[PDB]
Amino acid sequence: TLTEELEKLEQQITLTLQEIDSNFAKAHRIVTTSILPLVEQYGEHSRAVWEATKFWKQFFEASANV
């Protein structure tokens, strides 16, 4: 009973450790999956928006510069 529970909980600990590793790696996969290309696309479209603002900003600069 004593050594029984010892080995049992020891195996539970090892299993739980492997489970933690699995969840951890799952989060790792999620980030490495497509989050980086997603934000790259976001920044790309944002860059396009800056090209949009590149025109009208000139007029505001002109207003400041008379």
Partner 1 sequence: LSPLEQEVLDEYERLSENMKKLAVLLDELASAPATEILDGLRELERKTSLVFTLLKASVYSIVLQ
Question: Which positions lie near partner 1, rule CB under 8 A?
Answer: 59-60, 63-64
Q: Which is nearer to partner 1, 42 or 60 (CB)?
A: 60
Closer of 45 and 57 to partner 1 (Cβ): 57
Q: Say how far apart CA 2 and CA 5 lie, in whole Å.
A: 5
SS3 33: helix
Compute the chain's Rg from CA coordinates. Answer: 28
User: Is the Cβ of residue 55 or residue 59 nearer to partner 1 in the bound state?
Assistant: 59
> Least CB distance from residue 63 to partner 1, whole Å?
5
Residue type present at position 6:
L
